[PDB]
């Protein structure tokens, strides 16, 4: 029978897949913690063998017909296995697309903009230009850096994007999708029992509905940031106009977190930084991860494995081997969970340790599931379940409980206001950018935007949605989105938006579970076993069930809700309303100086 054949095929497949995936993950780990040519080539052969085996099994798995499979776990496993991805095209088209991706990657990593009239002062983005975007206050230098990187990236990446869109559209239509946007929206598709059905076309309208009510809070934040920047820049910013694109603290305006010194509410009040307290008490990375483990066992989740402590790196090795600075949590398979992080004794690395151990706990919980179902419910759940730990770890209650912060510490409203404003600049400010970018990519892949009117559409929407105007007029020979890392290297961007919604939804659900009686931003989930069990019910599922069922399991709702996000920022929203009475909230679409 077809169902029994699929069961035996999956039983045969899982053990081989787990072995080859472990070999690939171990080779990738060995490259990531020890960078050399031999580790790179070993990783290359391991990934080649694993990918070849996966495609070979996927071609056999596509022979099965899903119309006669009743059990939803086997059907979901076969759905996961049958995603061919880029292999649906012919060898010529796949090779051309891979060539375009590789040239985009190697031209983004070697991006170069150089000083006019000073030819020796040529700057790359990664060491020097990000410092200019984060710290510099000079208008002309930021205008130079933004326009120069836009020119020397957009002019070289416009035709590459022109055939990139066509090849991705061909690949998606070869995989029974309407466009590449629908292929990305198929990651959120859930087929299951009645009432849990979610569709790809639903997602867009859901995002628009959730952006219908974030807009007043974003408008108040934009007005406050515009007023503070007007204080910084006297005549170059208009009261009723949009913000300039190069004054947002980042290269692309993705995060507003670098505007915090310019937009501080109370400069006299310090931040909640506890780095000096860690220095005085002689803390190290081992103590940081031990405190994180103490937090995760206080909430009720299981302890860390012995292999986690034995195999991970928590410090710069300094023995001659190059490592990657980015913290990453690795689920190698067969119960092997590791963290690669060069942990310095700082508050930021402490929160990052909580985030990555949240990733590891998420990986550990679904280990009982089959190999094809050892993933997140969607792309947003995995990062949200680490972001909630990062949220809870940073609270003054958590820092006072573990001795980092003194017992007699006074929490006045001013530190809560400026902390909430910094969180809004990091978190709320990226949401219109994410929504506008994803909407632009979806409409480009769909063909709703005409081919010769790409740029003119994008700068309209940034004037309309993000409320950010271009500093200089750009014609259609530019490719202004393509300067971002995620879009030049073929990465989905809606995961950050869904992460942001799910993070506050999970946080409010856990705080209601833990019976916290105060403001949401002060909430800690420590010493609450019931919240840990409520969380672990979702964490144990993996993607065995539809993501709507997991969302109902945590928050009691089957869709995205931004009421937790507004509830988190409610004191800040009241404060922004209190200081925007005289000013004009909102922006005008036409270019105002």
């Amino acid at each position: 029978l077809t169902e029994e054949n699929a069961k035996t095929f999956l039983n045969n497949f899982n053990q081989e897949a787990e072995d080859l995936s472990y070999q690939s993950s171990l080779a990738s780990w060995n490259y990531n913690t020890n960078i050399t040519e031999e580790n790179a080539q070993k990783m290359s052969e391991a990934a080649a063998k694993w990918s070849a085996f996966y495609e070979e099994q996927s071609k056999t798995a596509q022979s099965f017909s899903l119309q006669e499979i009743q059990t939803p776990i086997i059907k979901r496993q076969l759905q996961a296995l049958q995603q061919s991805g880029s292999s649906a095209l012919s060898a010529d088209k796949n090779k051309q697309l891979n060539t375009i991706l590789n040239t985009m990657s190697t031209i983004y990593s070697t991006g170069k903009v150089c000083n006019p009239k000073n030819p020796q002062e040529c700057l790359l983005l990664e060491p020097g230009l990000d410092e200019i975007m984060a710290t510099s206050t000079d208008y002309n230098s930021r205008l130079w850096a933004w326009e120069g990187w836009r020119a020397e990236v957009g002019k070289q990446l416009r035709p590459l994007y022109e055939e990139y869109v066509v090849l991705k559209n061909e690949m998606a239509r070869a995989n029974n999708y309407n466009d590449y946007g629908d292929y990305w929206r198929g990651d959120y598709e859930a087929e299951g029992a009645d009432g849990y059905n979610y569709n790809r076309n639903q997602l867009i309208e859901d995002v628009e509905r959730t952006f219908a009510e974030i807009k007043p809070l974003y408008e108040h934040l934009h007005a406050y940031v515009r007023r503070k920047l007007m204080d910084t820049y006297p005549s170059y910013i208009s009261p009723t106009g949009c913000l300039p694109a190069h004054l947002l603290g980042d290269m692309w305006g993705r995060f507003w977190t670098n505007l915090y010194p310019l937009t501080v509410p109370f400069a006299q009040k310090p931040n909640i930084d506890v780095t000096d307290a860690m220095m005085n008490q002689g803390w190290d990375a081992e103590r940081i991860f031990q405190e994180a483990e103490k937090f995760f066992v206080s909430v009720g989740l299981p302890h860390m494995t012995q292999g986690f402590w034995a195999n991970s790196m928590l410090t710069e090795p300094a023995d001659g081997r190059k490592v990657v600075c980015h913290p990453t949590a690795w689920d190698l398979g067969h119960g092997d969970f590791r963290i690669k992080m060069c942990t310095k004794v700082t508050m930021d690395n402490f929160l990052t340790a909580h985030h990555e151990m949240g990733h590891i706990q998420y990986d550990m919980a679904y280990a009982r599931q089959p190999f094809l179902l050892r993933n997140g419910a969607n792309e947003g759940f995995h990062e949200a379940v680490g972001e909630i730990m990062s949220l809870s770890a940073a609270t003054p209650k958590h820092l006072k409980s573990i001795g980092l912060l003194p017992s007699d510490f006074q929490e006045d409203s001013e530190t809560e206001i400026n902390f909430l404003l910094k969180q809004a600049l990091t978190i709320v400010g990226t949401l219109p950018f994410t929504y506008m970018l994803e909407k632009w990519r979806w409409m480009v892949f769909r063909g709703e935007i005409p081919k010769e009117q790409w740029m003119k559409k994008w700068w309209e929407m940034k004037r309309e949605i993000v409320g950010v105007v271009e500093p200089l007029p750009h014609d259609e020979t530019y490719c202004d989105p393509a300067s971002l890392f995620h879009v030049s290297n073929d990465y989905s961007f809606i995961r950050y938006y869904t992460r942001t919604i799910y993070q506050f939804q999970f946080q409010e659900a856990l705080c209601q579970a833990a019976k916290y009686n105060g403001s949401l931003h002060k909430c800690d989930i420590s010493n609450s076993t019931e919240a840990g069990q409520k969380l672990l019910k979702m964490l144990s599922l993996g993607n065995s069930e539809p993501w709507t069922k997991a969302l109902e399991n945590v928050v009691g709702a089957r869709n995205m809700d931004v009421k937790p996000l507004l509830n988190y920022f409610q004191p800040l929203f009241d404060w922004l309303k209190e200081q925007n009475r005289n000013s004009f909230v909102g922006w005008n679409t036409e270019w105002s100086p």
Partner: protein, 99 residues
């Protein structure tokens, strides 16, 4: 790769039974004809043990002791402690089952 286990078999094993057969498991309707592929899998799969595995996957050696009694006299009996010998006193003696 020297430790193997049987993943596929037509019927369940009876108690205290072994199966050392290397016949290709025929899961469908078509004959396997000795060649692996689709719906024809080799039943013996390797336990690829590595030291960095999780505690649930590390190799465990198992010895099962099964005790049986038959109509024959039981001849596997545990040691009976022999205490020191005391002479010239009234002591309860147990010498080779003679009490």
């Amino acid at each position: 790769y020297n430790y193997l286990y049987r993943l596929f078999r037509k019927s369940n094993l009876k108690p205290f039974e072994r199966d050392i057969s290397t016949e290709i498991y025929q899961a469908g309707n078509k004959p396997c004809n000795g060649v692996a592929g689709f719906n024809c899998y080799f039943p013996l799969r390797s336990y690829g043990f590595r030291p960095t595995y999780g505690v649930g996957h590390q190799p465990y050696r198992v010895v099962v002791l099964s005790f049986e009694l038959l109509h024959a006299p039981a001849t596997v009996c545990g040691p009976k402690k022999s205490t020191n010998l005391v002479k010239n006193k009234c002591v309860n003696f147990n010498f080779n089952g003679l009490t």
